[PDB]
Amino acid sequence: LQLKLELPFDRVVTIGTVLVPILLVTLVFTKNFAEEPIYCYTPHNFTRDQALYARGYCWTELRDALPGVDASLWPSLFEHKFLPYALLAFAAIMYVPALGWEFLASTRLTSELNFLLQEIDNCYHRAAEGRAPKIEKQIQSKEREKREIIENAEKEKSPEQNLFEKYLERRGRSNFLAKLYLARHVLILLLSAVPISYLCTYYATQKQNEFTCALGASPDGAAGAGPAVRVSCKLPSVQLQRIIAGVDIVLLCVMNLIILVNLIHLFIFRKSNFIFDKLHKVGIKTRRQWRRSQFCDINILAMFCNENRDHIKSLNRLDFITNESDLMYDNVVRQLLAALAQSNHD
Amino acid sequence: LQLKLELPFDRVVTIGTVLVPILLVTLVFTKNFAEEPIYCYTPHNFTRDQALYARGYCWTELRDALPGVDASLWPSLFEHKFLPYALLAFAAIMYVPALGWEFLASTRLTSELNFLLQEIDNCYHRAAEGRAPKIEKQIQSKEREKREIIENAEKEKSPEQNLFEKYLERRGRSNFLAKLYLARHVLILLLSAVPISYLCTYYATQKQNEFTCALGASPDGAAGAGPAVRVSCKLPSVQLQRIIAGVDIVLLCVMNLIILVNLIHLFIFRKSNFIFDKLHKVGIKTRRQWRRSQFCDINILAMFCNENRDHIKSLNRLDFITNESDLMYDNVVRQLLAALAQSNHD
Amino acid sequence: LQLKLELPFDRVVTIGTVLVPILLVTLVFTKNFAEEPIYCYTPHNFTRDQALYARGYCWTELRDALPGVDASLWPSLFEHKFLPYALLAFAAIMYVPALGWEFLASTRLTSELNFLLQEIDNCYHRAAEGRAPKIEKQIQSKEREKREIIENAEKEKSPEQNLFEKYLERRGRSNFLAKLYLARHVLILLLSAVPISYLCTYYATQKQNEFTCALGASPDGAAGAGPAVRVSCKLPSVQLQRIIAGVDIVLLCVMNLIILVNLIHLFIFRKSNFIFDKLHKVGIKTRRQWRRSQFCDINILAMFCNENRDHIKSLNRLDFITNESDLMYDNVVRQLLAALAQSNHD
Amino acid sequence: LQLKLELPFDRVVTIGTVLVPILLVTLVFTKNFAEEPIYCYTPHNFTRDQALYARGYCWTELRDALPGVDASLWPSLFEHKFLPYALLAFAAIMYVPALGWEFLASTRLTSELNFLLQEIDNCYHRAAEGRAPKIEKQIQSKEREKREIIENAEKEKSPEQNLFEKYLERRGRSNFLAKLYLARHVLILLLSAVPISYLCTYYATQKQNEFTCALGASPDGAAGAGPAVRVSCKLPSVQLQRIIAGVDIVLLCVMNLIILVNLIHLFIFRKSNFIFDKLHKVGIKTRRQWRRSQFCDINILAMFCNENRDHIKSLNRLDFITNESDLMYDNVVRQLLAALAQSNHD
Amino acid sequence: LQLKLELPFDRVVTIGTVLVPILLVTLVFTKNFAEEPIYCYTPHNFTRDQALYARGYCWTELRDALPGVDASLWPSLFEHKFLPYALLAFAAIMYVPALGWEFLASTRLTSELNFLLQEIDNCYHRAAEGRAPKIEKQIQSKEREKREIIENAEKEKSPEQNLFEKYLERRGRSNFLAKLYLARHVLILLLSAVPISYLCTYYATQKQNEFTCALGASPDGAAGAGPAVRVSCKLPSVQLQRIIAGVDIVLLCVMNLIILVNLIHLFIFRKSNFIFDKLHKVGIKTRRQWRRSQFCDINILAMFCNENRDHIKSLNRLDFITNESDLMYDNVVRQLLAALAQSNHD
Ligand SMILES: *[C@@H]1O[C@H](CO)[C@@H](O)[C@H](O)[C@H]1NC(C)=O
Ligand SMILES: *[C@@H]1O[C@H](CO)[C@@H](O)[C@H](O)[C@H]1NC(C)=O
Ligand SMILES: *[C@@H]1O[C@H](CO)[C@@H](O)[C@H](O)[C@H]1NC(C)=O
Ligand SMILES: *[C@@H]1O[C@H](CO)[C@@H](O)[C@H](O)[C@H]1NC(C)=O
Ligand SMILES: *[C@@H]1O[C@H](CO)[C@@H](O)[C@H](O)[C@H]1NC(C)=O
């Protein structure tokens, strides 16, 4: 079968950052192509062909005039016509970082997690093996419990246990994957900084519906220049665009806040991770020699393991048999169950 | 199952070189067919049928006139009508080289990599076999370490190790696949040279929206010639085409730069490859007898293997157990683990 | 699984001969149906229904008139209307020969190659068997090498090797499949000879965009004949058709040249084939008794096997272990490897 | 898996007889619906609604008038409107016989060929068994060869060989399947006789493109009858229909000729079939007791087996090992190979 | 896999009774929607909106008028508008009985045929077993043959032979399934009786294309009633509907004739059925105790068995090894083959 590399945070982010804006984009496209581009109040003299020319020129030129001349460069309205493509551009731009992280991390994370799942499976098999002599030691004794636990900790270190210790020690000082994850999310934030600014500058000031274009050719001059006509036009699609702009602004701002909160929780406020607590459940040191640097590789690997917690069978059951992450502090029940489950079968 | 032959770099290149321009092409087609081809300001007399004839003729002829006669050959505008097809032609042309390389390298690379993966699997199985006597030699000894490593290197040459040496020696002087890869990427660059030039010539000079056509027939002469009418027309689709042209120019220029940078890094600045370092991890000579020519077949086979790194199981684990590519310079732990993992099982 | 019979060159030919023209045909259809069939400058008096009748009649009749009567038969323009169907006809005609060859060779080539792949597999298994006693012979000896090779050639002839020799001898004088392949490619060339001629005769002379039709009925005579009106019409789709005609002409001419070059290389300039050299690698006579007639069945079976080179596992490896097609001229390493690989396993 | 019953000649016939006419029919439909039904030169007085009524009535009535009254029954043109449905009817009618033969022969031919393939497999297994003692007999002898072959023919008759003889004798006088095949192909020819005649009558009689209809009601009489107006109409789709009619005529005539030639070759000129020659290859009588009647069931079963030649494995190889259909006339090599292949394995 | 129950004759019937009329109905829909509903010769005064109102009213009312008043109920034409739905209704009604039979017989036929196929398989295995001692008896003897056959017939009764006898005896008097099949076919005929009559009534008398409707409202009265205008209208779709009606009539009448002939052949003229002759082949009584009532269950089960002939392997071969349905009357070959094929294998 296949192993998962997603994580609910990342998929929620990509959904709310790309899928929703794509839906709004297609909705705007449908609304705009269902209606007519522009509505121009052509004079009475205009024939139907001339009126069509006016309604086409005023939608291609799309530049508002002023009562008097008042300028040679008068305000334009091109953004009302260009937005429903800029939204697609923003959707693609904000979808790029997920693809980049996928390309840059697929093989590496696949290999690392493939090794880690087997390593944890063997670690919990070793835990099953090592809990067996504890009951015999306790009966031999029959603080007692404290000294028994201390001597067990001293004398239990297995070869694969040293393998785990060395692996954790080397990973703790190899922040490559944490670097990549932080880079991906910071890149998402920085890219989102662009459309937020653009839309806020578009929702804020450039919200105009009606203008008055000026047609230039004006035939019928009869060897003369001819009268330059001014035609008042109104755009029908500005309202939905101006509403979708605000919707997208709010959505992307909320996504930015969510990303920042998650990063702060993971790299500053977080103290205990998944794998560390899971190992401590069976009983290990978890000393600071591989800690005190929250910007650590295992720190994020914990999240992937938690998502893939059920990709490995054994661990699963061992987690739900007990609680409190003190599996080795009971005298009889929790360890006696494993004793009768495994020791006799051999 | 299937084995991959696509490098992330090549897939990124083909995406950004073909898929994006195809998307822009279909967007331009949608915009052009949603709108109306041309908008002509027909005179007042023109009936609807005559106006339709004018709006069709001026879009078929598509040749701008001048105030006076001033010529018999006056500037044309055929490109504004022809571009959204030349863009498809460029997309297909730039997709050609990938298909050519596929057709010319499928079987050869398939066979070569099928042989290489099995060879490396057997090589690492041999490494597992050969690490076992090293611990026994060390205990027999109990600079010591340096002389032990030297004698091990001298006396460890295995039959399949000689197979590997001969294979590498013969591949180092057979640059066929490197020739083909350089040819493919240089061909992509050369093909990109064409549309870049064309679009830059189109975005640069031939960018105008409004012209004035001259209708020729002019019936209603009543046994006479008739009046040759001049009709001012405006194209609605020039703006989007002129923007997509710039977008494509920038995209393809960036792709060209990426191609050149990758080639320079791979064939000039690169010093160490994947397979060489991987073999040196277990310990081999890696002498210059099969090196000093970066334009080498194994140089790219390294990249193909790296993409297919996880297609071979054993190697994977052996990479993450240790680091520093000095697996055999550790006295106990690294080789003691393998000794207990393999020697006792026999 | 399935076995291939595509031989890249044929697939390239059929692509460039059928698939591309089909794409151009559908592009022309899209352009023609997106536009209007004809644009006619109807007089002022014409109502909308009469103008529609004129624009329909002048596109159904589609025969250009002349200033005066000047004839009862005046030049026509039916090809501008008929081409985008003749192009489909040419595509189908050029696709026919591939289907014919498939129908006529499927079963026979399937059977022949199914026999040949197993036959070569057994041959290389025999080669593995026969290299084993050679090393013992050399050690017994310990020109020596030349006499050893000669005696080995004399005394090594195996039963299945006589099967090989008889099969090759009988195939060398049975040119049925070579006949069929030459017939297929010559038929493709001959069928291409038609569309090239037609399109060149169309791109060359029958190229004009505007004509003047003459409407016949002319009601409103009020018990009289009525005025025969002349209406100037312009076709919008001639330009794209005239460009696609040239594109197809160039493409099919290049395909013809490629076919001719490939045939000349294969049947005249070619001297060594795949199977012959592959057998000589292990060492056989390859005498002219089954050669000197390049128009030979085994000649194209060699290409078919080369395409299917990896459909037989063993051979593959045996090709990449050595080079120079002198596998049995090395004293030790090449045959010592096989000796340790096979002799001990028995 | 599945067994084939397609006999490529039949598939070619059905292709060129049904699929091509269906393609032409859909092409005609596309052309007719893309265009306008009829083009009528309505007078000036007509409004747009009256002009639409005229253009609809003259295409529903579709009956040409004459200058004077000249009749009450004047020539009609209904076939120009009805053909693109008669073509569909002809396509379905000519597809019927294939479906009829399928329904009437599926089970019977399935069972017969399922029995025959196993019978021939067993027959060639017996051939392998029986060639073994021939070498021993020859060595015992060591005309000699002729007497050995004669005595082998006399004494070799095996049980399943008598089974084969009885089966062939009973099939030779049971012409049911040959009857059915001849009936199918003669029925295809007879059904083709209809559309050939109809189209040749249509491609030769109906060539009118233009007529002059007479509208009947003519309101505005103001308590009077009103003027019966005559409107000249032109059909746009007659040209393509008239061309497709000729194309279909030629195609179906060529198919008829191909069918007749194939039947004449199979049932009159044919002398040797597949199964008879294949059995004679190993050596049997093939006497006229089951021959002299070319209209025989086994005659077409031979073609069916030839199409299914590779559906049985053993036979395949046994065909390519030798040639000349004289397998048992070779002294050593051909039979010695089989001896070493089979006799020792037991 | 799946077992077949379609009885291809019933597939032919359902095809020709439902699938063809559905094709004709969709063709009529395509014709009617490609054209316009009605063509009305509106007077000159009518504007375009009033003309549209007239062309819609006269097609909604669809009731022909008369020159004088002549009635308050004048002939209608609703059928010309209602037929292309009545055809769909008839198609569904005709498809109903097949669905009913399937729903009512699926499980029962599944169980019955599942039993019977294995039952016949066991019967033919028993026949293979029982032919073996016959050769021994014949050699013991060495009318002789007649006495041997009669003593075999008396002494060969096996337990499963009595199972066969009892099953046949009990089925012969259980005519439920024959009842169901006859009911299905007679119901198909009776349901066909409706559309045949309706269409023959529609094709016969209700055939007129042109009528003259009378518009009622007639505004512009200026405080007065207004002039009741009469508008001549013509339907364009009557011709194709009238042709399709005749086509359907002929098709369904021919289907009725086929059904009647098949039923008469099956239940009156039929004498020997598949299973009876198949069992008589190996030799059984087939006495009239389970016969003389052609309206019998096994009578129809024979057809399903014949369709499912090849669904049981053994039977197949045993049918074609011999002929004449006298397998046991041959002395040596037919029985010696089975003897040497089975007796030695035990
Ligand atoms: C209108 O038509 C007359 C002749 O028909 C021509 O002289 C005049 O220039 C036309 N006016 C315009 C504005 O084209
Ligand atoms: C105008 O109409 C009259 C008759 O109605 C015709 O003789 C004349 O040719 C028409 N003029 C043109 C320019 O077609
Ligand atoms: C013109 O209209 C009148 C009635 O308005 C009609 O009688 C006459 O036939 C029409 N012209 C022709 C050529 O039919
Ligand atoms: C045309 O209109 C006038 C009044 O508007 C009316 O009297 C006359 O009957 C109308 N024509 C017909 C054919 O009814
Ligand atoms: C025509 O217009 C007048 C006023 O302009 C109005 O009173 C009258 O009702 C109109 N005609 C009809 C038929 O309504």
- Could you tell me the two tokens for D218? 């003519």
With an 8 Å Cβ cutoff, are E341 and D159 in contact? yes
CA separation (Å) from E69 to B148, D221, E221?
Answer: 126, 20, 22
Between CA C335 and CA C139 the distance in angstroms is: 13
| Residues facing A233 on adjacent strands | A40, A211
Which residue from D51, D212, D323 is facing C49, i.e. has the nearest CB?
A: D51
Query: Exposed (0-12), middle (13-18) or buried (19+): which is E271, by Cβ within 10 Å?
Result: exposed
Which residue from D56, D115, D163 is facing E236, i.e. has the nearest CB?
A: D56
**In D, which residues are within 8 Å of E236 by CB distance?**
56, 59-60
Burial readout C75-88 (b: 16 or more C-beta within 10 A, e: otherwise): eebebbbbbbbebb
Residue C179: which residues within 8 A CB-CB, separation 6 or more? none
Mutate to test the pocket of ligand 5, among E49, E50, E220 (most ligand atoms within 8 A of CB): E220
**What DSSP string runs through A134-175?**
HHHHHHHH--HHHHHHHHHHHH---HHHHHHHHHHHHHHT--
What approach was used to elucidate this structure?
cryo-EM
Residue with tokens 């919200």: A207
Residue D210: which residues within 8 A CB-CB, separation 6 or more? C216, D232, D233, D234, D235
C294 touches chain B (CB under 8 A): no
Instruction: Name the 3-class secondary structure at E346.
Output: coil
Between CA B312 and CA B322 the distance in angstroms is: 18
Q: Which atom of ligand 5 is nearest to the CA of E222?
A: 13
B176 touches chain C (CB under 8 A): no
Helix axis angle, E78-141 to E176-204, nearest 10°: 150
CA angle C343, C344, C345 (to 5 degrees): 95
Dihedral of the alpha carbons of A108, A114, A117, A121, in degrees to the nearest 10: -150
**What DSSP string runs through A238-272?**
HHHHHHHHHHHHHHHHHHHHHHHHHHHIIIII---
- Say how many Å lie between the CA of residue B46 and the centre of ligand 1: 9
Question: CB–CB of B291/B172 below 8 Å?
Answer: yes
- Say how many Å lie between the CA of residue A39 and the centre of ligand 1: 29
If one counts every other C-beta atom within 10 angstroms of the C-beta of residue A46, the result is 18
Residue with tokens 């460029």: B90
Nearest CA to ligand 5 atom 14: E220
D216: nearest CA partner in chain E = E232
D48 touches chain E (CB under 8 A): yes
**In A, which residues are within 8 Å of B340 by CB distance?**
159
Nearest CA to ligand 5 atom 3: E222
Dihedral of the alpha carbons of C305, C309, C313, C314, in degrees to the nearest 10: 80
Between CA B229 and CA B35 the distance in angstroms is: 26
Between CA C192 and CA C259 the distance in angstroms is: 11
Q: Across chain D, which distance is largest between two alpha carbons, in Å?
A: 123
Helix axis angle, B78-141 to C313-320, nearest 10°: 80
Mutate to test the pocket of ligand 4, among D49, D50, D220 (most ligand atoms within 8 A of CB): D220
- Say how many Å lie between the CA of residue A191 and the centre of ligand 5: 65
E219 in contact with ligand 5, CB cutoff 6 A: yes
B95 touches chain C (CB under 8 A): no
D227 in contact with ligand 3, CB cutoff 6 A: yes
Interface probe for C, chosen from B53, B62, B96 (most Cβ of C below 10 Å), is B53
Least distant ligand from the CA of E219 = 5
Nearest CA to ligand 4 atom 8: D222
Chain breaks in chain C (C to N over 2.5 A) after: 142
* Residue B294 DSSP code: S
Question: CB–CB of C324/C277 below 8 Å?
Answer: no
Chains D and A, touching by 3 or more CB pairs within 8 angstroms: no
Which residue from E11, E39, E320 is facing D115, i.e. has the nearest CB?
A: E320
Which residue from B47, B110, B166 is facing C44, i.e. has the nearest CB?
A: B47
Question: CB–CB of E127/E43 below 8 Å?
Answer: no
B218 touches chain C (CB under 8 A): yes
C313 touches chain B (CB under 8 A): no
CA C19 to chain centre: 12
| Residues facing B233 on adjacent strands | B40, B211
With an 8 Å Cβ cutoff, are B56 and C36 in contact? yes
D101 touches chain E (CB under 8 A): no
C217 in contact with ligand 3, CB cutoff 6 A: no
Question: CB–CB of B212/B232 below 8 Å?
Answer: yes
With an 8 Å Cβ cutoff, are A53 and B34 in contact? no
- Say how many Å lie between the CA of residue C219 and the centre of ligand 3: 10
- Say how many Å lie between the CA of residue E44 and the centre of ligand 2: 22
Between CA E94 and CA E195 the distance in angstroms is: 9
CA distance B284 to chain A (A): 25
B45 in contact with ligand 1, CB cutoff 6 A: yes
**What DSSP string runs through B144-210?**
HHHHHHHHHHHH---HHHHHHHHHHHHHHT--HHHHHHHHHHHHHHHHHHHHHHHHHHHHHT----E
| Residues facing D76 on adjacent strands | D63
B44 in contact with ligand 1, CB cutoff 6 A: yes
| Residues facing B214 on adjacent strands | B230
B244: left (phi over 0), alpha (psi -120 to 50) or beta: alpha
CA separation (Å) from E248 to E92, E243, E259?
Answer: 14, 9, 16
Within chain C, residue ranges assigned H as helices are: 8-14, 20-34, 48-61, 78-141, 144-155, 159-172, 176-204, 238-264, 274-282, 297-307, 313-320, 333-338
C237: nearest CA partner in chain B = B60
Instruction: Name the 3-class secondary structure at B82.
Output: helix
Q: Are strands C210-214 and B230-234 parallel, antiparallel or unpaired?
A: unpaired
Question: CB–CB of A290/A169 below 8 Å?
Answer: yes
If one counts every other C-beta atom within 10 angstroms of the C-beta of residue A329, the result is 14
Backbone angles phi, psi at A30, to 5 degrees: -60, -45
Instruction: Name the 3-class secondary structure at D201.
Output: helix
Between CA C272 and CA C277 the distance in angstroms is: 7
A85 touches chain B (CB under 8 A): yes
B101 touches chain C (CB under 8 A): no
**In D, which residues are within 8 Å of C52 by CB distance?**
36, 39
Signed CA dihedral, E294, E299, E300, E302: sign only: negative
Burial readout D252-286 (b: 16 or more C-beta within 10 A, e: otherwise): beebbeebeeeeeebbeeeeebbbbebbebbbbeb
Burial readout B111-150 (b: 16 or more C-beta within 10 A, e: otherwise): bbbbbbbebbeebbebbbebbeebbeebeeeeeeeeebee
If one counts every other C-beta atom within 10 angstroms of the C-beta of residue E157, the result is 10
Least distant ligand from the CA of E47 = 4
